Design a protein. Structure first.
Lengths: 509, 517, 514, 58
């Protein structure tokens, strides 16, 4: 770092971050998501509509922001819609908390008041348990619950994506009591429409498939990054291609060498060779005759997905597999995935933990936007598995916490009296984020929600009914939340907010 | 990078175009002036022909290069007109700028310029329309030749060059073939000669001579053994080489290569030959066997050069010594070494009194500059004369033709309703650029020279009267015999408009600067 | 190090970037239109009139400027015509948005206002589309002939065109099965005829190398065997590694004659697989060409890679990286080989081709510079007429439809809005620039031509558009100016997705900082 | 405007002129716009004399 003086980090650094955070979740949160352009070190267009992703990609130069980054990342694992919340609740509380400081309120006196308010907020949340639904045998129930999560993360086809994520997540384990984070793995294959994406189960290798079939039930695999150019460690790993005379004997010789390799795996157990290494011209010929599958050209990502599920372990050497390097899948077969030929394995009773949604788009640009919707939606299913408490649609949750917190200023006083009040406004930052998206007055949005006085129903979503004002029931629309989502978000948000607010000058020479 | 559009695009185009145009206009016509230019190689190159000037310079901006390509096609098709086409092109862009600041879009300029040039081609078609047989052509052809040879500077005792050229277009060409014959024509130049000796070689010349003077200086009609066999080191693409050591391996090698060279001479002589042309020539050693089994031979012929000698003579190929037959041997009338006029020029001729399917035009001059100048006069001269052998339609140059056309264009310009009218009249002043620029060369003021010619074109409506183009104090183009092909001028006028029309059309320019090559 | 900028200064950076890139492809497409010349470093200059080509070579640094690559490419692949228009339109939507965003009045209901326009806009084009295969002819080649004439007159010629237009009809039917932008290629000559064209139904090759014979070497076959090689012939052939030396005693003349035998072998392998006619990508050697003339066989070097790929599709054959052939889908055959000089430049014609899904036009313009645009006219003709067979729905060309959509969107602009009026009207205004610009660069009055047409639409009609042959008003459905209905529809959706994307973005994160 | 009136004068002679109603190209034979002969002789001869003095002026 660099040196600082006059307790600058508290007044100055805290508000710089607030803004940096702002408007990358103050318009890509709620019922319509919005694209932001991120260019990475290998430059390409990348559209983000998700809070956790855009921060991983950014290099945080502010030390004030970095705390807040970590808490968003916990929330990415845990909810995938409490991740959008960390930023907006946290930034807003510091802006308001700065105002209090000027009056003379001490930094910790306010921190007391935010903490009794948070415990209190959590007491209100069982009054914001409005209806309970949970069928994990029904695609129909699941899709409505995910629907507000994926909405925030996409501007596209909301309804169609909701059926694909629901179909994957239910179908894999409809009797599980807990679900996994890498239970669904993405496969990102080029071509076709967005609404031409589909659902398979088990591992898909998105890279080239060759050999020739020979089984559809015996799906034993052995995983290598070791090439078959002429690399074998049971004998010598040297090639002879630097001499013209030898190179010719070697081309002819590669045929027989390849037969030794293929058998060497298979006999001890394989039917499909997983090969991150490369398969020569002559090599490709011997496997076609012999009739063992090849899944050629596998990058590190492709091989790791495979290893983690089956417990097959890769080496850069080729020797017959021991049992720890052997995996098994319930099935394999060769059929097109989205209308492109690949290998599809099945897992849904072997160990599950890998389903595949094929993300399609004639360009990689269309795919990233749907990558965010599914990946966040994995972890939203993991909340609905654990509990059934159903929390109304976005932004309709937020009003009631604000109304009962205002009561909390009046009944408690102290020097915490002020802090509690700004805790109240700070939950209103979330529908003010929707007012800022809609581009109409903040104040008018807030006015309608208090006037009808409905608490757990009414909010201004993103519509053309949000342009000339109206209010709508987000309790009944297929836009629902869950209890734990909000319980986690708030807890880690208040964790993050308070602790940046403590900071004082960096002392260095 | 920057985006240049519109005015930015057209401003750049005048700046580039003009630089080329200024050198050309001061080297235009037979009153034309030599330009002595230095390279950065410490060398000096003395130029005057418009094409060599385009090869020499690599001035900034694309527009320079687009003129370069244009001139190259035209050297083969017409010949001369290389100076003329480019100076006319810059005139269009100066006028376009005058109309562009008035508020005229370049697409208006583009269509009206293309439409004006069609008025001018029609005017130039009127002057002749004769097509006459080859013999009758020969006197008009020689008069045209003077002019063309004159526009590469000097033409005094250059009447040999013109008379050899009529033979040269006749042999290679038909009268109504309608194709090019300048890939059948070999230009040859060698230093030490004279510009007063020009020879027509009805075969081919190799710069090589006999291996001995002791071998005969005549060889019979036909019986040429075309060969690829070594009698000296052939420089093999094989690899690791090894040398002899000591007295014994030295001797063994010498006797071996001598023994093999004698056997080779005998098989050539048996299938019937008296000329060996060998790719890989003769060594000192090899000389001994060849005189002893007495067979004139040329030492060394280039890799590709051996093909060129075969097609020219019409002779029948024998690729190699492994391929010797008596049913395939090349053609000749005689094979003799020729001294042209000096013993400083030694070329050895395989000349034809049989089938000739190419003609070598052998021109000489005493120094490097003198042959350069003479080759370029003569090639361009040959080409203009090939357009005329086919169709002997002739117009008198010097800018007389252009003035007449300027009158014709200027009237026709305004009788159309479209917005091109202003362009079309600027086209008429733009044709006048060429006697204006000739005047700069003559030693005369640009302006009054054009208007003297013009009154005389109001009378006749035909070029055959004008101003000075040789300088002799006559006001005639038919007592001066300043003559260019009809297709040739028509070609400078149509090509220049076609080119400049792309340049007006394009106003979409991605450069960082204003010019990049 | 990361550059991040937000709010309004980023919003105005994005929009502005887009406009500069458009200027290039704005004034273009026509005989009264423009061509584009981009030099992006020395000896990297192209002439084009296709939007896509320039933009790839052009540098981009803005995300708004990067967006346009994906829009231009997908248009170009399919139609090959109207490429410039999509990128013009993509940029144009943004231009009219620009005073609201500066002001800070920016809903994201604004992008959603565009998505609604695109919908109404597209319904109209189909609705006014009249399927031409039903409506007219029954032989339908004369139908195709009319598209050809107008298409030849949207890049150049307006009089030579009537002769050139029947050739296109024939070619188009051989070719139609998927558009090729590289089997419709046209070869250049001038100086033996000027302004005439011939249809050749097979292939041609510009480059051939042989000077050891021509009259003495045969060049007419009635059952050629074509070797489509990429290998080189050499003076003498190199031997394989290890051993062989020159001199010691015996090796002096020995080795020399062996080299000659290997060279001969490579030739004899070519011949005995199937050779009477040889094409080879890389030079035919000096002694090699002499050999071929000796045996009475034709040979050709300096072939481009591209030309060989055309010929194989015609033959049913393939390119050989080998010196022998063991299959007739790897060797090539035709039923005519002839070599004829047009313009005095050698053309290797193969015609009577088994498949004959390739064509060659031997075109004589008036100049080399002239030819470049005359080739583009024939090329524009082949693409568009083909795309007419495929999408039999065809609407009026000339940018005629767009004036009616401007007006249609103006009527809905009136009806719809709670704030939408500014934005739907922006969409409408944006359409009109596209024919208006072609009037304007041309130097005729764009207000005088378009607005007069809108007026005639009002009495009744929809196909009154701009004839760009002279840039004045005309019926462009009675003048038979035609381009398919689908072209426009593809343009509208893709264009509106590009524009929407940019306005959504108010943050650009450059993570390398570079 | 002035390109087109030139072409009308070339063919017909006594034709179109700048008309105050139209703003443009319509006959002035249908709407009389007259000027006396001296008013145009004056514009030209005086103009030339002034341009003559300036050219002659050192």
């Amino acid at each position: 770092a660099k040196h600082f003086s006059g307790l600058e980090e508290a007044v100055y650094r805290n508000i710089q971050a607030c803004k940096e955070l702002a408007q990358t979740t103050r318009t890509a949160y709620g019922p319509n998501g919005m694209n932001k352009m991120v260019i990475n070190h290998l430059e390409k267009l990348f559209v983000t509509n998700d809070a956790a992703t855009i921060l991983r990609e950014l290099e945080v130069q502010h030390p004030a922001a970095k705390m807040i980054v970590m808490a968003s990342h916990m929330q990415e694992q845990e909810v995938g819609d409490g991740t959008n919340f960390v930023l907006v609740f946290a930034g807003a509380l510091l802006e308001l908390a700065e105002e209090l400081l000027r009056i003379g309120l001490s930094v910790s006196e306010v921190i007391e008041g935010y903490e009794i308010a948070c415990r209190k907020a959590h007491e209100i949340l069982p009054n914001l348990v409005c209806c309970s639904a949970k069928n994990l045998r029904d695609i129909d129930e699941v899709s409505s619950l995910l629907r507000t999560s994926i909405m925030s993360k996409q501007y596209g086809n909301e309804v169609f994506l909701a059926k694909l994520i629901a179909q994957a997540c239910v179908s894999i384990f409809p009797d599980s009591g807990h679900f996994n984070v890498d239970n669904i793995r993405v496969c990102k294959i080029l071509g076709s429409g967005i609404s031409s994406s589909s659902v398979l189960h088990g591992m898909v290798f998105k890279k080239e498939t060759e050999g020739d079939v020979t089984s559809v039930k015996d799906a034993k695999i052995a995983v290598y990054s070791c090439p078959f150019d002429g690399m074998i460690t049971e004998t010598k790993g040297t090639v002879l291609i630097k001499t013209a005379e030898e190179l010719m004997n070697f081309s002819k010789g590669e045929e027989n060498l390849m037969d030794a390799q293929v058998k060497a795996i298979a006999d001890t157990g394989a039917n499909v060779v997983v090969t991150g290494g490369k398969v020569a011209d002559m090599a490709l010929h011997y496997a076609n005759k012999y009739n063992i599958m090849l899944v050629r050209l596998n990058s590190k990502w492709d091989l790791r997905r495979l290893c983690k599920t089956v417990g097959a372990t890769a080496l850069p050497r080729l020797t017959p597999p021991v049992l720890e390097e052997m995996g098994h899948c319930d099935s394999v077969y060769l059929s097109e995935v989205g209308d492109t030929q690949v290998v599809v394995f099945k897992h849904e009773k072997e160990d599950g933990a890998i389903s595949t949604i094929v993300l399609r788009g004639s360009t990689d640009n269309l795919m990233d936007d749907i990558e965010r919707a599914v990946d966040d939606g994995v972890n939203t299913f993991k909340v609905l598995t654990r509990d059934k408490r159903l929390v109304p649609g976005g932004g309709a949750t937020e009003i009631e916490l604000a109304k009962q917190i205002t009561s909390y200023g009046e009944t408690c006083p102290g020097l915490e009296q002020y802090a509690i009040k700004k805790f109240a406004e700070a939950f209103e930052a979330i529908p003010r984020a929707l007012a800022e998206n809609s581009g109409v007055k903040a104040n008018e949005v807030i006015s309608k929600l208090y006037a009808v006085h409905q608490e757990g129903n009414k909010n201004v979503g993103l519509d053309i009914e949000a342009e000339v004002p109206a209010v709508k029931d987000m309790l009944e629309a297929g836009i629902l939340d869950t209890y734990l989502g909000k319980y986690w978000a708030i807890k880690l948000a208040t964790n993050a907010a308070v602790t940046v607010l403590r900071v004082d000058q960096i002392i260095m020479a | 990078k920057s985006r240049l559009m519109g005015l930015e695009a057209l401003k750049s185009h005048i700046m580039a175009a003009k630089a080329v145009a200024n050198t050309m206009r001061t080297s235009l016509g037979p009153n034309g002036l030599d330009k002595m230019m230095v390279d950065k190689d410490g060398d000096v190159t003395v130029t005057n022909d418009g094409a060599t000037i385009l090869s020499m310079m690599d001035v900034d901006h694309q527009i320079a290069k687009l003129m370069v390509e244009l001139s190259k096609s035209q050297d083969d098709e017409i010949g001369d007109g290389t100076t003329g086409v480019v100076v006319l092109a810059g005139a269009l862009l100066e006028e376009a700028e005058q109309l562009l600041d008035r508020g005229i879009h370049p697409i208006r300029i583009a269509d009206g310029y293309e439409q004006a040039a069609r008025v001018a081609i029609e005017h130039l078609d009127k002057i002749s329309d004769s097509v006459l047989v080859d013999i009758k052509d020969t006197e008009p052809l020689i008069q045209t030749a003077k002019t063309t040879l004159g526009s590469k500077v000097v033409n005094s005792c250059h009447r040999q060059m013109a008379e050899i050229a009529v033979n040269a277009v006749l042999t290679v060409a038909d009268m109504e073939r309608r194709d090019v014959d300048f890939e059948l024509i070999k230009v040859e130049g060698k230093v030490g000669g004279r510009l007063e000796d020009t020879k027509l070689i009805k075969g081919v010349i190799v710069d090589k001579d006999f291996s001995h003077p002791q071998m005969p200086k005549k060889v019979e009609d036909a019986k040429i053994a075309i060969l690829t066999c070594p009698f000296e080191p052939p420089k093999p693409k094989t690899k690791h080489k090894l040398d002899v050591t000591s007295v014994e391996d030295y001797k063994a090698l010498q006797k071996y290569e001598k023994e093999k060279f004698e056997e080779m001479i005998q098989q050539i002589k048996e299938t019937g030959a008296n000329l060996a042309i060998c790719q890989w020539g003769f060594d000192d050693e090899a000389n001994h066997l060849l005189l002893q089994n007495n067979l004139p031979a040329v030492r060394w012929v280039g890799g590709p050069e051996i093909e060129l000698i075969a097609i020219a003579t019409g002779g029948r190929i024998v690729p190699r010594f492994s391929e010797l037959t008596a049913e395939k041997l090349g053609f000749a009338g005689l094979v003799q070494e020729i001294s042209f006029g000096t013993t400083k020029d030694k070329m050895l001729v395989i000349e034809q009194c049989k089938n000739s399917r190419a003609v070598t035009i052998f021109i000489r001059g005493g120094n490097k500059m003198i042959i350069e100048e003479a080759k370029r006069s003569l090639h361009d001269a040959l080409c203009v004369i090939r357009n005329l052998i086919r169709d002997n339609r002739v117009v008198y140059g010097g800018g007389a033709a252009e003035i007449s056309c300027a009158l014709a264009v200027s009237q026709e310009a305004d009788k159309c309703p479209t917005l091109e009218q202003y362009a079309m009249r600027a086209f008429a002043d733009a044709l006048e650029v060429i006697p204006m620029a000739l005047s700069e060369n003559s030693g005369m003021n640009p302006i009054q020279t054009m208007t003297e010619v013009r009154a005389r074109q109001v009378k006749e409506m035909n070029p055959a009267l004008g101003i000075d183009c040789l300088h002799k104090g006559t006001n005639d183009m038919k007592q001066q015999h300043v003559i260019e092909t009809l297709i040739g001028k028509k070609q400078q006028i149509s090509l220049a408009t076609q080119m400049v029309r792309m340049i007006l059309k394009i106003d979409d320019i991605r450069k960082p600067g204003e010019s990049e090559e | 190090g990361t550059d991040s900028s937000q709010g309004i200064p980023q919003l105005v950076s994005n929009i502005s970037a887009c406009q500069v890139i458009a200027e290039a492809v704005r004034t273009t497409l026509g005989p009264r239109g423009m061509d584009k010349l981009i030099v992006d470093g020395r000896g990297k200059a192209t002439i084009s009139n296709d939007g896509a080509t320039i933009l790839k070579l052009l540098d981009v640094v803005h995300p708004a400027a990067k967006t346009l690559v994906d829009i231009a490419k997908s248009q170009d692949a399919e139609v090959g015509d109207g490429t410039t228009s999509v990128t013009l339109l993509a940029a144009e939507f943004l231009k009219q948005v620009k005073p609201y965003v500066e002001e800070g009045l920016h809903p994201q209901i604004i992008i959603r206002a565009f998505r609604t326009a695109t919908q109404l806009a597209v319904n109209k084009i189909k609705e006014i589309a009249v399927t031409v295969k039903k409506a007219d002819k029954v032989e339908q080649r004369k139908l195709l002939e009319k598209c050809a004439m107008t298409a030849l007159s949207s890049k150049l010629i307006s009089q030579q065109k009537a002769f050139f237009a029947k050739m296109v009809v024939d070619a188009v039917m051989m070719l139609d099965d998927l558009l090729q932008l590289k089997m419709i290629g046209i070869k250049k000559v001038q100086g033996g005829a000027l302004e005439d064209s011939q249809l050749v139904a097979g292939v041609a090759f510009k480059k051939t190398f042989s000077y050891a014979g021509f009259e003495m070497q045969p060049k007419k076959y009635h059952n050629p065997k074509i070797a489509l090689l990429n290998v080189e012939l050499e003076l003498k052939a190199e031997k394989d590694n290890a051993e062989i030396r020159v001199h010691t005693v015996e090796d002096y003349q020995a080795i020399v004659d062996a080299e000659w035998n290997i060279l001969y072998d490579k030739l004899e392998k070519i011949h005995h697989s199937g050779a009477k006619v040889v094409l080879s990508k890389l030079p035919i050697g000096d002694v090699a060409t002499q050999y071929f003339a000796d045996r009475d066989m034709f040979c050709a070097g300096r072939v481009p890679e591209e030309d060989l790929k055309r010929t194989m599709m015609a033959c049913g054959g393939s390119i050989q990286t080998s010196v022998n052939a063991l299959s007739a889908d790897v060797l090539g055959r035709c039923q005519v080989f002839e070599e004829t000089q047009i313009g005095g430049e050698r053309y290797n014609f193969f015609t009577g081709c088994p498949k004959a899904k390739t064509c060659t036009f031997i075109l004589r313009g008036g100049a080399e510079q002239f030819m470049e645009e005359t080739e583009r006219s024939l090329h524009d003709a082949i693409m568009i007429v083909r795309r007419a067979i495929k999408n039999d729905s065809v609407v009026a060309g000339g940018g005629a439809i767009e004036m009616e959509l401007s007006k249609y969107l103006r009527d809905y602009s009136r009806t719809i809005p709670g704030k939408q009026q500014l934005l739907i009207g922006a969409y409408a205004k944006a359409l009109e620039i596209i024919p208006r610009q072609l009037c304007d660069n041309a130097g005729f009055d764009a207000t005088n031509i378009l607005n007069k047409l809108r007026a005639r639409h009002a009495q009744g009609g929809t196909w009154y558009g701009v004839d760009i042959n002279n840039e004045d008003i005309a019926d462009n459905f009675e003048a038979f100016v035609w381009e398919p209905a689908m072209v426009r529809i593809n343009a509208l959706t893709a264009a509106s997705e590009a524009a929407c994307l940019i306005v959504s973005v108010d943050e650009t994160i450059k993570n390398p900082r570079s | 405007t002035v390109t087109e009136l030139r072409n009308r004068h070339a063919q017909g002679e006594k034709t179109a002129g700048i008309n105050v109603r139209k703003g443009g190209i319509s006959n002035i034979l249908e709407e009389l716009v007259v000027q006396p002969l001296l008013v145009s002789v004056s514009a030209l001869t005086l103009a030339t004399e002034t341009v003559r003095s300036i050219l002659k002026i050192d």
